[PDB]
Ligand binder design. Structure first.
Ligand code: PRO
Ligand code: PRO
Ligand SMILES: [Mn+2]
Ligand SMILES: [Mn+2]
Ligand SMILES: [Mn+2]
Ligand SMILES: [Mn+2]
Ligand SMILES: [O-]
Ligand SMILES: [O-]
Lengths: 483, 484
């Protein structure tokens, strides 16, 4: 069967991947007692956009649910699936003659049928007529709430849809639940995105020099991923935090745009992940700008390495993800006590939520077509109302096929530290004279992507992690030399 | 005063640039009979967005009118300008405490005042109160139609604006007319974006090898522009057309995504331009993939080079831009005849609109904060209803301070050639036995950015252009002398 491929050494992704997703979705809907025979899933693809009211085109990236089901890269499409038979129909825009001048070849419907291995291809302007002839009982459309953005996913619509019976409640929970469990074909793509992004992280560690701007490494990373990996997009805006900016969790956005000069003595926290054919990677490396950990940097770093490997060591089916978050909290507190930043009973520190002062984010999240993938909080799964834990993007138990990030960190964040020092229940644990030395340290995050297996996990990421590995990598003389 | 700067060798852009733009806008408004005393210009900045319903953030790029007036990089702002005094007030988001954890320092209003050199800074939720206290006669908001996209620019709104008198017709043509004429400070930025993008094009010509994917050069271009120029964005999606793809004017979008392997004997047409602090560049270089022009490639290429230099040499204040387009058409037809592709009377070819078969787009467009800059078709200026010319993004006369692209091209586009061959009014000019050799050739576009000056033009772009220069650049020399 056909494959998506960007040539060179890039991954061939079989279009059978998306056919399998459609089949799995149908199989799940068929078991839902509320789904009527003769139902048809109706999805609307993303459309071309421009910047504001300008005619400056925005590079099109497909909507994630549509991509999961069809793998279609072109804007302006719809796709439907007959639930009972699994038959798929792709609807493509009927393009004007001038498209040939400005945009490229006007491909035939047969070209698209062969390209995407769907059962049928029609034009978008025929969708009402085509669906009518199929005499569906009900159209199943996609509407629901993303539990990370809080946004409502907008359901498909077309001229004439009002003439049909439409249900917009059944589909969203079902397709989300399919996306949560990755197929072997999807795992092959996530192995690849992690391979290329890991290589890119290594090249960045080799390239970093005191005096560079943070964004020079953002640029280098994205250049490696695109030129060598075929990754035209990143999975999220690159986070290239040096010095105190490494305490800012999502540093790098337009308001803080990776524009600091890296200085001797800084820690770097680089959270970057290329995207291939709308599949994510999400990796963070932490390391000294000058290639040599100081004693304080080694201590903080190895604390996070300890929680990282303890969590990965414990992860297996049936483990409750909030228990892993609490395990990381406890290890951080133990290590910060060993360092002298903390004193007293770690049990009591845990009871006072002191861990969240140092790690004010969730331990990790589902990953897939989106970096913060869907399905973390389905109906019946509640958010835990405690510092740190309330930022968890899922409170589920682990099962095979789930893909998770494992991303403990320790940060020295002034407003959180100051709050803790004002609270007698927490201040007694904090040694002010030692902590003072760590003001402006930034932080350390060690982020791996893993897959839950029957007996444990599979690690997808492959970057240097021990202090020795990191220092060796940064001192390496050799491979990637743009102009 | 303060400047925008991304360090290293990047350009320091004084915030005074935006102060001057506000001043110029007020000066224009004070002369406008539709404008009464006590008016306040109210602009709304862009907001941050995410991909579809996901929480994947999209990198924020400021809305172009707002950028022109204020130079503000942060999402969620508004900005107002008192027309009579010129006093500027920036409104910034009142951020949640958690911003300090996730996004960075919660800067003070004073920080933004110093940063942007405005007269006052307030929080966005206070805009109704602050405007009420000023007792304005009317709020002037921005609404109009972009003549390239057809889109309606959406006016500012805030909770309570219905309590004010609002006019949404006066401002748009006036701010557009200011934008058409670049200040010396703006020209400094456009010289810089052309400098960096030119360097990047030269690095690309040096790096191109048979066997590479088109997108490898897209990547390399953008990497040069960001790491060396501080250009986080491109001005438009890179067009890296090799072989027959060079006939596709805006190749490289998601449906044709720069994914062809470059072959020996191919021509390349690379239209790429980095953006710095929301100022554009727009440059096209055409060259043989293997570094050596064939006789056929040299002939097509030098035809476009001739029209490029003819137009640049003719441009000056008072010139009607459609006359430059017709000049390019005539030169292309002459040179296609000199190559044996066409025969007969060039006067007759022109009369038959044959030029548009080979150049089915406008000769060039205004450039500024947007690659297709505003103001090409103000009220009164009409689109010419002919092939090629109707695609012109302006039919204005040239004046000092305008910034234009000059981008003639010749392409071999099958459905257009076949239309001509089926049309008795055009078919006899075409020599099939010679044209057949150019089927699948793709095309050549040579695109320069220029400023209209009192005496003619200032060429901003600095890339190799002659056959000799290009071959040398690709051989690693980079080496050449610009048009003057
Ligand atoms: O947003 C999240 O969930 C993770 C936490 C640290 C950075 N990214
Ligand atoms: O869009 C335009 O006007 C120019 C013509 C060739 C490519 N870009
Ligand atoms: Mn991350
Ligand atoms: Mn993550
Ligand atoms: Mn161009
Ligand atoms: Mn142009
Ligand atoms: O992350
Ligand atoms: O262009």
């Amino acid at each position: 069967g056909p494959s998506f491929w960007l040539g060179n050494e890039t991954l061939k992704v079989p279009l059978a991947l998306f056919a399998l997703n459609r089949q799995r979705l149908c199989e799940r809907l068929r078991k839902n007692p509320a789904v009527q025979a003769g139902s048809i899933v109706v999805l609307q693809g993303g459309e071309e956009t421009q910047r504001y009211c300008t005619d400056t085109g925005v590079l099109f990236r497909q909507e994630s649910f549509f991509h999961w089901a069809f793998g279609v890269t072109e804007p302006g499409c719809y796709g439907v699936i007959d639930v009972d038979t699994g038959k798929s129909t792709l609807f493509v825009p009927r393009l004007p003659a001038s498209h040939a001048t400005w945009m490229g070849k006007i491909h035939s419907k047969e070209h698209f049928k062969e390209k995407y291995a769907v059962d049928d291809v029609q034009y978008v302007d025929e969708i009402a007529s085509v669906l009518t002839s199929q005499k569906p009982s009900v159209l199943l459309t996609l509407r629901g709430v993303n539990t990370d953005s809080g946004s409502v996913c907008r359901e498909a619509s077309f001229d004439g849809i009002s003439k049909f019976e439409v249900n917009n409640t059944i589909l969203h929970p079902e397709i989300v639940e399919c996306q949560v469990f990755k197929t072997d074909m999807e795992l092959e793509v996530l192995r690849y995105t992690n391979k290329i992004s890991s290589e890119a992280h290594r090249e960045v560690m080799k390239a970093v020099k005191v005096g560079m701007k943070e964004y020079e490494l953002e640029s280098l990373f994205e250049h490696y991923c695109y030129s060598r990996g075929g990754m035209r997009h990143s999975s999220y805006t690159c986070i290239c935090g040096s010095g105190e900016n490494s305490a800012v969790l999502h540093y790098g956005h337009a308001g803080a745009p990776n524009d600091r000069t890296i200085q001797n003595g800084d820690m770097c926290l680089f959270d970057m992940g290329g995207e291939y054919y709308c599949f994510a990677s999400d990796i963070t490396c932490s390391f000294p700008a000058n290639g040599k950990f100081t004693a304080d940097q080694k201590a903080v770093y190895e604390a996070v390495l300890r929680s990282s490997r303890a969590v990965m060591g414990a992860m297996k089916p049936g483990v409750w993800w909030p228990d892993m978050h609490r395990l990381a909290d406890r290890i951080h507190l133990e290590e910060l006590a060993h360092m002298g930043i903390l004193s007293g009973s770690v049990d009591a520190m845990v009871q006072a939520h002191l861990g969240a002062v140092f790690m004010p984010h969730g331990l990790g999240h589902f990953l897939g077509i989106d970096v913060h993938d869907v399905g973390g909080y389905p109906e019946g799964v509640e958010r835990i109302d405690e510092p740190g834990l309330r930022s968890l993007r899922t409170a589920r138990h682990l099962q095979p096929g789930m893909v998770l990030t494992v991303e403990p960190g320790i940060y020295f964040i002034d407003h959180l530290l100051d709050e803790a020092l004002a609270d007698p229940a927490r201040a007694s644990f904090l040694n002010r004279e030692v902590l003072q030395r760590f003001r402006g340290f930034g932080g350390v995050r060690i982020e791996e992507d893993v897959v839950v297996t029957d007996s444990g996990i599979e690690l997808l990421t492959c970057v240097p992690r021990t202090v020795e590995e990191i220092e060796a990598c940064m001192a390496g003389c050799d491979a990637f030399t743009p102009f």
